[PDB]
Design a protein around this ligand. Structure first.
Ligand code: FAD
Ligand code: CL
Length: 477
């Protein structure tokens, strides 16, 4: 019959959105979060990735705005910036500088603690949501393996008292992120292993927070620098994003085989060694506020519970626990929002009575969630699969059934069109913002746009406007 109590494990972006949506369809929702959740925008140990630059692409932003009206204005009122693409970015691709065409998509940029707080404030206020902070999910309860498995609840431990308690539930949602213990919980119930795809280019991140030149966060673009991506060499990248409070977040990254800064005096020289040194020129006199923070969470990985015949009833997996991506493409929060939107749109259809058990509904929900995360998976995996020394363990025929040399040729063509042809840039910006599938770049429509559109002359300098150079006090020469 119909769920009366849902338990959500984890209260970051995926779990907070999921709890909001589930409270609309289920009598009572409990949220279990290991951290204390701050009432001010502060970093916390359970989301260490929030130290690094975050873009909320228009796909995720619109889905959050639909679920939680007013959120976008609250973010802008608190200093977030709406960055139009490509218009508001100075971007060097492996094919040249991006012409700054009038924006066709956007992303919201704020410090990740402000985004998270603003969302929580909107989403966890409902009267039928109970948030248990400083509480750790320990294992799942129920039975697994052949025929009739079901999850009936969760063992939780209060971290202040050390006391463990059994939390019964009709539906359990794992939103505990890339560090989820899900595989261990499933093995303990007797559930067989999940199918999983990996495309792991060994990407790593190094980030410093800076005080920006006054006014740069409002009147100076974001800047994104990529390698010429010589076929046999690791990629190296850098981005500088404005966030609230007149600060710049600078995130440097590379793929397997290149070295990232780990000491502060190594940071600007890495940016100096990118294909164009502009990031170093911008940061050279900016005031650093933090040491270098690192991340090694850069692999693309995807679990396929929707394929497991022995998936247990009453269990859903969402967010980074289900699938996680190379952060350079910026889709994890959008993918989290898609998971919650999909639950919202499919919950009633899936749980309609008639089958006599929760199996049909659980499996139908997890199958719809699986379809919803396909776009960020195939985008990021396609972009990473041909890096030198990339580790590929995937069954996806879109990836493993195609000629590598053909894919490389396709990719250069798409990039070359996007930077200098406005009609191509619209379609590519749609895909890069997670609003059209990667498959659209192989369509008749896109190929025709690539062929028929004008192509502007190559840019020979970063396309800053004069008013922008004035802000940071640089000279075109
Ligand atoms: C370097 C880097 C840069 C990124 N940049 C971007 C970007 O630009 N744009 C974007 O959209 N995404 C970006 N991402 C991805 C984004 O951070 C995540 O997709 C997003 O946080 C959603 O993840 P989540 O809610 O599923 O899990 P997480 O955010 O990882 O949170 C999981 C939650 O579960 C809690 N938890 C864990 N274990 C337990 C337990 N046993 N019991 C209870 N609670 C538990 C944790 O404390 C945490 O609150 C980036 C990621 C990284 C690493
Ligand atoms: Cl991290």
């Amino acid at each position: 019959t119909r769920p009366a109590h849902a338990v959500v494990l984890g209260a970051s972006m995926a779990g907070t959105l999921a709890a909001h949506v589930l409270a609309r369809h289920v009598d009572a929702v409990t949220v279990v979060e290991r951290d204390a959740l701050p009432e001010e925008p502060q970093h916390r140990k359970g989301v260490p990735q929030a130290r690094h630059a975050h873009l909320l692409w228009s796909n995720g932003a619109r889905l959050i705005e639909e679920m939680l009206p007013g959120t976008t204005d609250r973010l802008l009122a608190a200093g977030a910036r709406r960055l139009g693409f490509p218009e508001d970015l100075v971007t060097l691709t492996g094919q040249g500088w991006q012409h700054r065409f009038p924006a066709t998509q956007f992303a919201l940029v704020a410090s990740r603690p402000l985004l998270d707080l603003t969302v929580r404030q909107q989403a966890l206020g409902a009267d039928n949501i109970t948030v248990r902070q400083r509480t750790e999910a320990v294992e799942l309860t129920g039975s697994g393996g052949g025929s009739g498995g079901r999850v009936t609840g969760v063992v939780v431990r209060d971290l202040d008292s050390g006391r463990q308690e059994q939390l019964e539930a009709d539906l359990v949602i794992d939103a505990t992120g890339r560090g989820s213990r899900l595989k261990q919980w499933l093995a303990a119930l007797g559930v067989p292993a999940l199918e999983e795809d990996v495309v792991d280019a060994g990407v790593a991140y190094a980030t410093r927070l800076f005080k920006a030149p006054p006014g740069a966060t409002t009147h100076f673009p974001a800047v994104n620098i990529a390698a010429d991506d010589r076929v046999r060499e690791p990629g190296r990248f850098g981005v500088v994003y404005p966030i609230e409070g007149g600060r710049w977040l600078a995130t440097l990254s590379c793929t397997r085989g290149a070295q990232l800064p780990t000491h502060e005096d190594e940071f600007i020289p890495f940016a100096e060694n990118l294909n164009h040194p502009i990031l170093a020129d911008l940061l050279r006199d900016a005031e650093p506020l933090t040491p270098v923070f690192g991340s090694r969470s850069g692999a693309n990985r995807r679990l396929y519970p929707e394929r497991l015949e022995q998936w247990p009833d009453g269990l859903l997996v969402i967010g980074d626990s289900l699938t996680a991506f190379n952060p350079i493409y910026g889709h994890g929060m959008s993918s989290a929002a898609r998971c919650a939107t999909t639950i919202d749109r499919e919950f009633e259809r899936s749980v309609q009575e008639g089958t006599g058990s929760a199996r049909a509904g659980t499996r139908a929900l997890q199958k719809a969630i699986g379809a919803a995360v396909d776009d960020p998976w195939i985008l990021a995996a396609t972009k990473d699969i041909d890096y030198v020394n990339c580790r590929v363990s995937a069954t996806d025929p879109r990836l493993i059934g195609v000629d590598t040399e053909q894919r490389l040729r396709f990719a250069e063509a798409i990039t070359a069109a996007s930077i200098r042809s406005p009609k191509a840039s619209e379609i590519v910006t749609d895909v890069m913002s997670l609003n059209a599938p990667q498959a659209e770049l192989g369509s008749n429509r896109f190929l025709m746009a690539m062929r028929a559109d004008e192509r502007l002359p190559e840019l020979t300098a970063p396309p800053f406007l004069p008013e922008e150079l004035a802000v940071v006090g640089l000279d075109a020469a």
